[PDB]
Design a protein around this ligand. Sequence first.
Ligand code: GTP
Ligand code: DZ4
Ligand code: DZ4
Ligand code: CO
Ligand code: CO
Ligand code: CO
Length: 218
Amino acid sequence: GPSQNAIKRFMTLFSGREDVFSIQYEGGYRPIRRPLNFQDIKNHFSGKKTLGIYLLKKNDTVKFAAYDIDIKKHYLNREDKFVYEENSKKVAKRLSRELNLENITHYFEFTGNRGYHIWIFFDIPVSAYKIKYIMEKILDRIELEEGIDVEIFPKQTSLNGGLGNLIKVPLGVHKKTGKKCLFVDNDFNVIENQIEFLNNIKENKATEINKLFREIFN
DNA sequence: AATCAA
Ligand SMILES: Nc1nc2c(ncn2[C@@H]2O[C@H](COP(=O)(O)OP(=O)(O)OP(=O)(O)O)[C@@H](O)[C@H]2O)c(=O)[nH]1
Ligand SMILES: Nc1ncnc2c1ncn2[C@H]1C[C@H](O)[C@@H](COP(=O)(O)NP(=O)(O)OP(=O)(O)O)O1
Ligand SMILES: Nc1ncnc2c1ncn2[C@H]1C[C@H](O)[C@@H](COP(=O)(O)NP(=O)(O)OP(=O)(O)O)O1
Ligand SMILES: [Co+2]
Ligand SMILES: [Co+2]
Ligand SMILES: [Co+2]
């Protein structure tokens, strides 16, 4: 059925480090040094465990990347948090328009707390520095707003013997809030059938990202 | 019970 298919698709889409992943706990993240398996993602989908995925594989390539749009410390102010939520959506729209201009299929996720991830998937892994370079150049073309931060994952071009950086992956529970981390549409509305949306996510052509990298400069 | 990174 669609739901077990989505388990195998999740594995193929959020494939990062071959033999290490992470789990979100209250107060941080903990590396689990073993390959991810089916049960780990059933724990993810059920709310039992929440998974993060190290982007960089051992040869310093990634099969996916993501923008991380954050509403920074609102704290008190005048409960104007709405303006900053509005600002987070404007910034994501701006990033997303540039991605479609460059013909890069991408997907929005509500993160369960203060923002949105923009996910880009590839059919074959590409060099971490290439897509990082692309995503910095696109960030540089757009206006930003007060209270908003934009982070680019991968955060490093190369492991240097380490693990690199991880990102919490969708369809699970943000421990900080109890909310589901869910895909939304082009106007930030929650998809009703999260499973079917996942089963229809399209991968970009690695052969077209590589050409774009060179064209973006040379 | 809690790491690793920029
Ligand atoms: N690897 C790693 N990344 C972290 C850690 N803490 C924060 N980050 C990441 O670094 C980003 C910026 O760090 P901070 O500005 O200190 O965290 P923040 O919670 O966004 O800060 P404010 O919202 O401004 O209070 C966060 O949004 C995370 O992506 C950590 O302990 N390890
Ligand atoms: N202590 C840690 N150790 C390792 N990785 C960590 C980490 N804290 C965060 N990360 C990693 C995991 C995170 O997924 C990623 C982004 O950090 P956020 O922006 O702070 N958290 P998210 O975007 O997922 O949801 P929201 O912002 O709405 O609260 O950095
Ligand atoms: N004076 C106004 N007139 C019309 N809509 C208005 C408005 N003030 C606010 N709105 C609101 C009501 C509308 O729901 C909303 C539309 O704003 P986006 O979704 O950000 N722009 P688009 O529709 O083109 O989306 P996309 O690019 O993906 O195709 O703005
Ligand atoms: Co962040
Ligand atoms: Co975030
Ligand atoms: Co619209």
